[PDB]
């Protein structure tokens, strides 16, 4: 059960997210080509670091 | 998202081969490439598909 470092590269606006969550696109700190989309709450900035745990799923709405 | 990407590529390949709304097609193509310029050169199975779209377009 590893932990992965990742970085937000670009923050979406118009997904139609619910409540204090915004979707965002991240590139892996490890494999800096592999890039996915996750959802996240809290004020979150372009080009910054985020820790995650479950590296499996592309987040829905 | 990225799983959705290559199927869209095949659709654009079909679009170019049976060309229609070609400025639209080129436009969305370039958008996909620029927003993911790294992961495409990471993958492999793009290669043949991208050659198809290259020739057709």
């Amino acid at each position: 059960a590893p932990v992965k470092f990742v970085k937000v590269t670009r923050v979406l606006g118009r997904t139609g997210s619910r409540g204090g969550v915004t979707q965002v696109r991240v590139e892996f700190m490890d494999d800096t080509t592999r890039s996915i989309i996750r959802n996240v709450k809290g004020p979150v900035r372009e080009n910054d670091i985020l820790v995650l745990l479950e590296s499996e799923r592309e987040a829905r709405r | 998202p990225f799983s959705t990407i290559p199927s869209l590529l095949t659709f654009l390949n079909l679009f170019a081969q049976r060309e229609l709304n070609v400025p639209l097609t080129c436009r969305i193509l370039f958008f996909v490439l620029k927003t993911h310029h790294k992961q495409i050169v990471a993958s492999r199975t793009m290669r043949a598909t991208l050659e198809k779209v290259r020739a057709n377009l």
Partner: peptide
């Protein structure tokens, strides 16, 4: 919901092809 709409439509067209 917009890109999601085109996502499912893409999926449907893949099945069609």
């Amino acid at each position: 919901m917009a890109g999601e709409r085109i996502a499912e439509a893409l999926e449907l067209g893949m099945t069609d092809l």
